[PDB]
Amino acid sequence: KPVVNTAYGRVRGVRRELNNEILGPVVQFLGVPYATPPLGARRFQPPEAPASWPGVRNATTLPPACPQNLHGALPAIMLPVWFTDNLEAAATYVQNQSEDCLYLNLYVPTKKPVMLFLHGGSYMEGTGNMFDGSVLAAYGNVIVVTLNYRLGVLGFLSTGDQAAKGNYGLLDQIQALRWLSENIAHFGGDPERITIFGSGAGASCVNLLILSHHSEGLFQKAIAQSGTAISSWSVNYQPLKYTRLLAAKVGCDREDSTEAVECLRRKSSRELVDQDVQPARYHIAFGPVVDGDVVPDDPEILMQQGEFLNYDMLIGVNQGEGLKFVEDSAESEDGVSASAFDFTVSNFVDNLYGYPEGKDVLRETIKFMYTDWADRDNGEMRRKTLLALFTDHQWVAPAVATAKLHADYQSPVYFYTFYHHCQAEGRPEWADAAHGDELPYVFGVPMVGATDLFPCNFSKNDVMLSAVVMTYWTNFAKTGDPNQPVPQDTKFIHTKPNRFEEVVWSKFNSKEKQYLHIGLKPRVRDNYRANKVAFWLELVPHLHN
Amino acid sequence: QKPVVNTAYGRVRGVRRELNNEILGPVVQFLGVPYATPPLGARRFQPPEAPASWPGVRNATTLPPACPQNLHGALPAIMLPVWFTDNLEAAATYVQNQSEDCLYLNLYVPTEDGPLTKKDSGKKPVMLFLHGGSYMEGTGNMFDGSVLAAYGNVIVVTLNYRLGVLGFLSTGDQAAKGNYGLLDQIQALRWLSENIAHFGGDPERITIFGSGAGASCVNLLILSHHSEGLFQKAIAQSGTAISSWSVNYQPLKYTRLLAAKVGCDREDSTEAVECLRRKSSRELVDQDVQPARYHIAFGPVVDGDVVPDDPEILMQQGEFLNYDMLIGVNQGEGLKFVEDSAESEDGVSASAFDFTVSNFVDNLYGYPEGKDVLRETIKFMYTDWADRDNGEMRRKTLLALFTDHQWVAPAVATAKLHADYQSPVYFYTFYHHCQAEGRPEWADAAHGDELPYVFGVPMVGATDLFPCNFSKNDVMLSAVVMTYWTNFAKTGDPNQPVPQDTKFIHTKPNRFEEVVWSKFNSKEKQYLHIGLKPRVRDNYRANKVAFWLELVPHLH
Numbered sequence A: 001k002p003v004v005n006t007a008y009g010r011v012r013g014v015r016r017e018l019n020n021e022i023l024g025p026v027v028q029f030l031g032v033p034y035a036t037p038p039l040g041a042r043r044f045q046p047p048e049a050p051a052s053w054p055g056v057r058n059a060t061t062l063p064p065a066c067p068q069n070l071h072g073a074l075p076a077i078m079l080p081v082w083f084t085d086n087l088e089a090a091a092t093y094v095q096n097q098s099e100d101c102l103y104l105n106l107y108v109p110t111k112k113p114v115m116l117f118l119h120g121g122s123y124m125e126g127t128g129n130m131f132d133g134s135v136l137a138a139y140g141n142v143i144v145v146t147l148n149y150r151l152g153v154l155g156f157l158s159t160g161d162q163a164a165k166g167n168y169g170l171l172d173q174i175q176a177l178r179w180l181s182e183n184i185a186h187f188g189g190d191p192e193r194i195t196i197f198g199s200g201a202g203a204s205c206v207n208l209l210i211l212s213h214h215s216e217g218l219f220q221k222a223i224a225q226s227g228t229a230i231s232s233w234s235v236n237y238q239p240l241k242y243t244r245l246l247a248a249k250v251g252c253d254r255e256d257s258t259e260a261v262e263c264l265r266r267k268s269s270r271e272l273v274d275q276d277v278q279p280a281r282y283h284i285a286f287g288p289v290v291d292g293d294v295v296p297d298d299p300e301i302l303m304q305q306g307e308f309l310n311y312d313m314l315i316g317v318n319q320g321e322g323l324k325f326v327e328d329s330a331e332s333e334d335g336v337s338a339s340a341f342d343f344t345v346s347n348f349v350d351n352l353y354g355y356p357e358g359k360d361v362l363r364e365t366i367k368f369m370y371t372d373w374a375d376r377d378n379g380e381m382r383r384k385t386l387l388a389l390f391t392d393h394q395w396v397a398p399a400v401a402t403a404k405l406h407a408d409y410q411s412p413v414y415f416y417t418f419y420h421h422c423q424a425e426g427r428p429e430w431a432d433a434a435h436g437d438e439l440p441y442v443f444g445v446p447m448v449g450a451t452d453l454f455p456c457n458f459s460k461n462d463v464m465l466s467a468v469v470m471t472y473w474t475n476f477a478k479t480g481d482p483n484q485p486v487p488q489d490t491k492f493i494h495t496k497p498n499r500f501e502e503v504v505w506s507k508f509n510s511k512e513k514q515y516l517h518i519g520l521k522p523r524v525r526d527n528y529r530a531n532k533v534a535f536w537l538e539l540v541p542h543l544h545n
Numbered sequence B: 001q002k003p004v005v006n007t008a009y010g011r012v013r014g015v016r017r018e019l020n021n022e023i024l025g026p027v028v029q030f031l032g033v034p035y036a037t038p039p040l041g042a043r044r045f046q047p048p049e050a051p052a053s054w055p056g057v058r059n060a061t062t063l064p065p066a067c068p069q070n071l072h073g074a075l076p077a078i079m080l081p082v083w084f085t086d087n088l089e090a091a092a093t094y095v096q097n098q099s100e101d102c103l104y105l106n107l108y109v110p111t112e113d114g115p116l117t118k119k120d121s122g123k124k125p126v127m128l129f130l131h132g133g134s135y136m137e138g139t140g141n142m143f144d145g146s147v148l149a150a151y152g153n154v155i156v157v158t159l160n161y162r163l164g165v166l167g168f169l170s171t172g173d174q175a176a177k178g179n180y181g182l183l184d185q186i187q188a189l190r191w192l193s194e195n196i197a198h199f200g201g202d203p204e205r206i207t208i209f210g211s212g213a214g215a216s217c218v219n220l221l222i223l224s225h226h227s228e229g230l231f232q233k234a235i236a237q238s239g240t241a242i243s244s245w246s247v248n249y250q251p252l253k254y255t256r257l258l259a260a261k262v263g264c265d266r267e268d269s270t271e272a273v274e275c276l277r278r279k280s281s282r283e284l285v286d287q288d289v290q291p292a293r294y295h296i297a298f299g300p301v302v303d304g305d306v307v308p309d310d311p312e313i314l315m316q317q318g319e320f321l322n323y324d325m326l327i328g329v330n331q332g333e334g335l336k337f338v339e340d341s342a343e344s345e346d347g348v349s350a351s352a353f354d355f356t357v358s359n360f361v362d363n364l365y366g367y368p369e370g371k372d373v374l375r376e377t378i379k380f381m382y383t384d385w386a387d388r389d390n391g392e393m394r395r396k397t398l399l400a401l402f403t404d405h406q407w408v409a410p411a412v413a414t415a416k417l418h419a420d421y422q423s424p425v426y427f428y429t430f431y432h433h434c435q436a437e438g439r440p441e442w443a444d445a446a447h448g449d450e451l452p453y454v455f456g457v458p459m460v461g462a463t464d465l466f467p468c469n470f471s472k473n474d475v476m477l478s479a480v481v482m483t484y485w486t487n488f489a490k491t492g493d494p495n496q497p498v499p500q501d502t503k504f505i506h507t508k509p510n511r512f513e514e515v516v517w518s519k520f521n522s523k524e525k526q527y528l529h530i531g532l533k534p535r536v537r538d539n540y541r542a543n544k545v546a547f548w549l550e551l552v553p554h555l556h
């Protein structure tokens, strides 16, 4: 239980032996502060330095979660599938929760790299306590850092201008990054190799922070897993509409904008969060905002403007992310009918577009792009294309658009496609890697049993691939190149053909656009979902005017 | 030996000819027997009438004249079969002696049961061949149907029908309803149906077969009120009644421009036509009145008579009797499309591509307001997004664009309609050309490249318009296509009587003896893929077909 010198005082940890031989000992520094508790006047405002404690600290204990309501106001399309599948177990990590939750975890193995994991799923739920970064830290020989940041209703509320600028949850994350860039050295890690990695909403932040001038020499490498800043549910373009309703429900609905927020300074957080103010399908009620400050402009304008540092990037998507989209089709058998098809695709255009000629054309033309024709009477293979309609539109299209944009400014990008998943009954046979199914592998869960969340029988291959992705990820934190240093050796556990042995993960550039197909039989292919992307990226634009 | 079949108009005497092959038997030829009164007087722009009954013995000995055309001018080259334009020189030699008086067919009567061992009379199928590239040129005289007849044991018959101005000038009035050529083919049909049995033909098994323009006529005749008890099987090769150039919906427009040129343009339409009669067949045909791009100036017309409606409606409506079908397209029809920049040897410029696509939606569509969307979303379709780089790909797909639009899409559409109204349809796809001197080695099989095989050219050696090296391999494939076609005019089902057998060429396993060729229904669109490695697939060009047939009506 060692103590360590930080610029605000000293903290205690816990050495804990892993039951696995390949995994070493780790020191866990759970629940260290990075910003003074944002209560009262410190609410709805940017975080600063934390308390300076004169003595020591007992940081051997998990911090509380941020004010959130898991039962009700469910944005179930957005969330990682393992979340909604096991809401039961999910609620466990968010019981002890206070408005004081600006806290940081550190998983240290004993000038190492640092991997800051930005959790989430909707901007509104979640906690860093969810993901035990012990196994990642101990296998990759890297410092893994989970965190907590204010959540949506309380962390992302905004008025049309000044009274509430918004994005307090994002600022909470760069103040956990200001703390890392000054103090991680003392834990045994190089502060010039901090990498920020996230999935879903978490990845939307990774990608936003890149574009934010509020973080420059704070991190130098980024990993976006299944999420971007140009996605439909990325940034809140309607923050006034949803702030009004929230204020209207508690009684803080003043005509004056700046007096309404001062009312909101007074009402209890337990009450302030649990309101049931929900967004329009596929959008966010509370999240990131174009404020002209932390996020200077629309992420898309910002990207082409190209005023961001050339971070080392690792972007990717899963095969069938949008499982949730074709959920009402669990008891179908005949799959989805054309009647059900024409319907679903119609109010997909409705919910994401709405303007004339497109209204009729765009809807009919994309229908054509997602029917097979070679076999068009088959419901079960209409189901798949419906799933990939969403998947393509929400994750694939935006990721390749992103990877392409940064690669053009000579920021090195490595594109991954995750095609493998654990079965986990209560699941279709056609499932094949839904949104957020990559996490258990990135966090080496298949090594240390099956946790509360991911319960399924991890076969010896699930264990193998878990390592494979870990060495890839962790390599990237060091070099900014997943291939090196540690070669793809898996014969530590099973001397069976380590199937990623001699495959080289080539850089993803613009013209040629190579990616890594992560799965059972891995490859480097050249153009992922080539024409279905180009559809959304090139053609669909012209079908508005 | 010169036999003398006695017809219903006189007695005709034809030369016997020994064919240039060991295994092929002799064939009696009846050349230039008349099927109508010559359409000469106030008989121009009139339907053909039965021929004059002669008392003597007629000499079906020499080839007939060809109907008046001008092979050195009117250049719908885009719709002409590539073998024709490639050999204008040699092709012209066949129309060297023209006459307004030209209405004759030629017969090719076999003598054997097909191929031989080197070592009661039944009635034979008749296969009428509708020739023609643009409705303006040609003569059945170009196709020496002796081989086919002798190999397949069918009487192959070719004819001449009025082309161009003389065959198709219409006013849309009672003055000149037009469609004469078609009526000619029908008059030949009437002649065959009545007399062919005298030659030992089976009038119950007359089959018409065309290619390109002639294949349109095939389709038009299937749809025409006039064809009834005459024929009963149709083979449509690379031709269709619904292509941008199968029917002319602007007859008067071009009749007026023509009349204007010979000083016959009156306001009254009877007065204008009755004027044109007074002009020589020669001054009238070699005149230069060119049509809008990918259309015909003089051709078939919707006239409520021999073409009761717009063919596409007649089909949708099921306004046609049940005929056995054989419809097909060749892998790379519109090779002449990418000619404008074809042998540049770095492909076609992307910057040129979007231009050649915009001219496309202009010529065929542009109207234009929905042109905007339509053009941009036919670009996206024909751009391979794997490599938006190599122009070789862009050139291949620019060809494909044209191939799909002009030839395959309407063919698959005609297939789907007759099938659904329940005529049996056999769908073929031709993926093989003989390499003719002086054309690209990206030269997949172009438009009209099927002919040599159908007529068994590779069996008796190269000719002057089919002048390529025919391999032992090219011989087999012809034996295969002929023994399909003939097995069709025989039983309406290409895999009936005679089996697939090319053991008269060395024992390279006969690829086609494995394959049973399924009828084409509109749901599971099964087609035989004719080529070096045949197989039976379903849904040829699924996407691109559906693109033009489902999506594109919805895009304007």
Ligand SMILES: *[C@@H]1O[C@H](CO)[C@@H](O[C@@H]2O[C@H](CO)[C@@H](O[C@@H]3O[C@H](CO)[C@@H](O)[C@H](O)[C@@H]3O)[C@H](O)[C@H]2NC(C)=O)[C@H](O)[C@H]1NC(C)=O
Pocket: B002, B058, B059, B061
């Ligand atoms: C249709 O063709 C026949 C021939 O196939 C033409 O009639 C033919 O006339 C010639 C001579 O007038 C005959 O040739 C023979 O010549 C030899 C040698 O000099 C002589 O010894 C024979 O006695 C005979 O004359 C030929 O046999 C004869 N054929 C007939 C009808 O018996 C006829 O001219 C052609 N019809 C037309 C359109 O004129």
